[PDB]
Scaffold this active site. Structure first.
Site, mmCIF file in Angstrom:
data_model
loop_
_atom_site.group_PDB
_atom_site.id
_atom_site.type_symbol
_atom_site.label_atom_id
_atom_site.label_comp_id
_atom_site.label_asym_id
_atom_site.label_seq_id
_atom_site.Cartn_x
_atom_site.Cartn_y
_atom_site.Cartn_z
ATOM 1 N N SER A 81 -0.035 -7.257 4.914
ATOM 2 C CA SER A 81 0.000 -6.259 6.040
ATOM 3 C C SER A 81 -0.917 -6.661 7.227
ATOM 4 C CB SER A 81 -0.208 -4.837 5.467
ATOM 5 O OG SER A 81 0.333 -3.863 6.342
ATOM 6 N N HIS A 236 6.171 -1.549 -0.077
ATOM 7 C CA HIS A 236 5.216 -2.210 0.718
ATOM 8 C C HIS A 236 4.107 -2.694 -0.192
ATOM 9 C CE1 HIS A 236 3.001 -3.324 4.269
ATOM 10 N NE2 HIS A 236 2.015 -2.500 3.971
HETATM 11 CL CL LIG Z 1 -2.213 -2.687 7.185
#
Ligand SMILES: [Cl-]
Ligand SMILES: [Cl-]
Lengths: 258, 258
Positions: A81, A236
């Site tokens: 991320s 995610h």
């Molecule tokens: Cl992040």
């Protein structure tokens, strides 16, 4: 047995080294070494995010980990991320320490636009912030934008394929953080001679509901990678929903760079 | 269905609310409500232990959770390890808010000796702190002894029956803490009218290598409880090594106090 590698793992904003608790022992049982960095004001780091004003300060534990490697050692550097931005920063400092950058459901910045470019593009596009709380903190060099995930947003957008125990754990440990968008808008562009010279691969989860599969192609079209790996059914938080498949992809990557 | 309860869970020194991540969803699936308190200087609490100089400050987030409860609500209060001291402290302030105290692999103080008595007894016979790091912090209250567990000591004495993932998690998350033995030696005795008036049960693990069975039988002989429950095969971190069996014991307790 073929050569093993040293993996340096870099977490996402608002989280900490703890996210890697499943993946670390898998890698270590296969003979690899693993260092899970804890970035500033993250996890159990004793600083509040407000005291960390810049992405360079935020990233300092990663720079220090790389600095302390013995001479001629190289790592597989994995950023998750916002960890994509962290590992690009590091790669611009220590390119010869990095065998390959693994962008895992990650921001993949380029060497043409300001460093915030891909973050700014996602913030324009994203519609599902839910109960996330946004706030500001004024610093002596300008506004710093902060965020604290809400639990509904976590469940629907980050953890929706994770075991409930993982979601409960995250609720216990997540922290207010920052994506440093102002600071990154003012930073010099990432260089071609440093960051751009390092080998890079992308690993994407097929059910990531924060970093969509078409926004990835956009980033990759904007700044190419060697190879794209796909983790089937990952959310995610793939190191928590599909740690074995993630191990499988990292394993493959290690085999391509032995 | 039988009516459900509200469990308030209190972790051990050096740890945090995160220890409860497996137990919490089990109890919530069964219809109960669960609050996992994060004590001062614990888990992601933003203060270092040097800033929490007394056991009353350390305990203040539990006190505030009890103070916040609506009128006439009563909880099942579970204290783990040093958590036993914190829940005794809380019972001396809000005894009518607690249905029952659950001492889980916990220190069980009395109302005859100074509050640090049962800890002093253990500390005197305890050996093999292993790689644990001890330090002293001088305060306006005198010297405070701090400890930070070492990873070899954790593996051998706390987590020996836990999944490797849980041991990795804990390496990521444990913090320097204190057993507050100085402050506890000086504090007023727990009162019979407060603490001593609350119902209490003990839940022990059969393979606890920190609080051995014989010492538990000595604490319970010195300060009786209403019932003792045992968890076969649990290590000290029984919420990580046998969460389902811990759930089964807490269920049984909740049936007893409906
Ligand atoms: Cl992040
Ligand atoms: Cl403890």
């Amino acid at each position: 047995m073929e050569r093993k590698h040293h993996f340096v793992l870099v977490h996402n904003a608002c989280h900490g080294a703890w996210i890697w608790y499943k993946l670390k022992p898998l890698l270590e049982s296969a003979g690899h070494r693993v260092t899970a960095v804890e970035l500033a004001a993250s996890g159990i780091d004793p600083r509040p995010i407000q005291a960390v004003e810049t992405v360079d300060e935020y990233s300092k534990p990663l720079i220090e980990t790389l600095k302390s490697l013995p001479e001629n050692e190289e790592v597989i550097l994995v950023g998750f991320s916002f960890g994509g931005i962290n590992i690009a920063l590091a790669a611009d400092i220590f390119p010869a320490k990095i065998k390959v950058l693994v962008f895992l459901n990650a921001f993949l910045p380029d060497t043409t636009h300001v460093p915030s470019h891909v973050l700014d593009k996602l913030m324009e596009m994203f519609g599902g912030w839910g109960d996330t709380e946004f706030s500001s903190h004024e610093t002596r060099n300008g506004t710093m934008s902060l965020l604290k995930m809400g639990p509904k947003f976590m469940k629907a957008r980050l953890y929706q394929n994770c075991p409930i125990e993982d979601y409960e754990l995250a609720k216990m440990l997540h922290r207010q953080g920052s994506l440093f968008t102002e600071d990154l808008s003012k930073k010099e562009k990432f260089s071609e001679e440093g960051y751009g010279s390092v080998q890079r691969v992308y690993v994407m989860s097929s059910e990531d509901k924060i970093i969509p599969c078409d926004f990835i192609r956009w980033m990759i079209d904007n700044f190419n990678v060697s190879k794209v790996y796909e983790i089937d059914g990952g959310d995610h938080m793939v190191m928590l929903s599909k740690p074995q498949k993630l191990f499988d992809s990292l394993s493959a990557i290690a085999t391509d760079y032995m």
